[PDB]
Coordinates of N, CA and C and ligand atoms in Angstrom, one line a residue:
X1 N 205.7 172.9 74.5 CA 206.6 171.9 75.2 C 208.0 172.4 75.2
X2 N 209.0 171.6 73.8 CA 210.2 172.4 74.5 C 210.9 171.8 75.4
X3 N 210.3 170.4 75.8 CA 211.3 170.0 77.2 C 212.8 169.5 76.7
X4 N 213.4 169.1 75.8 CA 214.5 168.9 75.3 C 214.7 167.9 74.4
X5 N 215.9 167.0 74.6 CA 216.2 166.2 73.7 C 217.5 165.1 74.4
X6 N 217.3 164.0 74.3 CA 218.3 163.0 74.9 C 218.7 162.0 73.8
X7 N 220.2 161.8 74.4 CA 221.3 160.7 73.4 C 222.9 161.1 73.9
X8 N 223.1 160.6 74.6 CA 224.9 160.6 74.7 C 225.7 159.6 75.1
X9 N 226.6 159.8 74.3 CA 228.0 159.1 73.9 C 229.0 159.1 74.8
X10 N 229.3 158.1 75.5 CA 230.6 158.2 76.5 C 231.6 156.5 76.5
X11 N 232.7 157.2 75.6 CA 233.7 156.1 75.9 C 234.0 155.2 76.7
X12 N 233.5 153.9 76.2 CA 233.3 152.7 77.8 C 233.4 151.6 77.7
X13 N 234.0 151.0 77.5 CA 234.4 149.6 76.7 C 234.0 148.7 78.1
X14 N 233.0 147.5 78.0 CA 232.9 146.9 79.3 C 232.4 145.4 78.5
X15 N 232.9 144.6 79.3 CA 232.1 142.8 78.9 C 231.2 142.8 79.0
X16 N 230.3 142.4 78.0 CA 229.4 142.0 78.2 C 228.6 140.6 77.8
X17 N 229.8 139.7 78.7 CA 229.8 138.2 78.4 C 229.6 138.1 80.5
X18 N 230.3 139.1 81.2 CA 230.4 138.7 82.5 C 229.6 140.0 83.5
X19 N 229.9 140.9 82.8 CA 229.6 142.7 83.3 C 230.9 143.0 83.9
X20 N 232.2 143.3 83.2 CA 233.3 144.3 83.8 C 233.2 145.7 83.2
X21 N 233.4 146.6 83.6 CA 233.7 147.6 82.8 C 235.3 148.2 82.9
X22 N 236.3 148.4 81.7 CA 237.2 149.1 81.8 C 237.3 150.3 81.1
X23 N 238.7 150.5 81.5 CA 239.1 152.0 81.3 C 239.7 152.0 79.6
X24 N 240.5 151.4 79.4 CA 241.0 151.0 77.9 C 240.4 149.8 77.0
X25 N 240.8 149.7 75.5 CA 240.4 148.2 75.1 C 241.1 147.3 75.3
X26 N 242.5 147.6 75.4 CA 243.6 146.6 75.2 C 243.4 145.6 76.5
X27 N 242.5 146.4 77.7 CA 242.9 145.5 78.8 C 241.1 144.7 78.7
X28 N 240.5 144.9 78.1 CA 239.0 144.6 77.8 C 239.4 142.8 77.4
X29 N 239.9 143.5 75.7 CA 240.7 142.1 75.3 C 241.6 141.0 75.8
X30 N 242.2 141.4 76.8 CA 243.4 140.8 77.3 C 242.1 139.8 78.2
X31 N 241.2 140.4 78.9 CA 240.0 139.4 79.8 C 239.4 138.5 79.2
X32 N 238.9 138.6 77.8 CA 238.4 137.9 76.7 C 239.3 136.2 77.3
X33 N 240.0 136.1 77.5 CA 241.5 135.3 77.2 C 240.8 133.9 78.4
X34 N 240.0 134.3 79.8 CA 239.3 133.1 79.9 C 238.3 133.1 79.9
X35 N 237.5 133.4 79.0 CA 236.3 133.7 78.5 C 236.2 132.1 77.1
X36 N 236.8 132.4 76.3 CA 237.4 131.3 75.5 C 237.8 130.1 75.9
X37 N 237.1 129.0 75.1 CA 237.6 127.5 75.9 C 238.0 127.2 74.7
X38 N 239.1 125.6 75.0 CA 239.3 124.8 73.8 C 238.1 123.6 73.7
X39 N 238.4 123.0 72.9 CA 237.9 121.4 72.7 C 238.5 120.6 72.3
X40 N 238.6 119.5 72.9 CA 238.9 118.6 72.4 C 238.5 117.2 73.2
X41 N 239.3 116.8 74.5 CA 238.9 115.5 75.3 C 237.5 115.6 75.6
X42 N 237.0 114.2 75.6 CA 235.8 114.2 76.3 C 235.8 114.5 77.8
X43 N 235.9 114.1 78.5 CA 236.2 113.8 79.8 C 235.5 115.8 80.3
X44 N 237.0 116.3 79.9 CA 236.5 117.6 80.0 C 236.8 118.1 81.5
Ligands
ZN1 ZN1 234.2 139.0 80.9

């Protein structure tokens, strides 16, 4: 046999709350931002 061997690693930070993918984290987290709700009123 001999056919080879698979597994690779590539830098990719992406949501996976909505499916974005970015290029950095800082701008990953910065989307987080309305992803997050408060609570409090009923009404809502
Ligand atoms: Zn998202």
């Amino acid at each position: 046999g001999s056919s080879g061997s698979s597994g690779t690693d590539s830098k990719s930070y992406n949501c996976n709350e909505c499916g974005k993918a970015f290029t950095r984290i800082f701008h990953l987290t910065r989307h987080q931002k309305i992803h997050t709700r408060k609570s409090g009123p009923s009404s809502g």
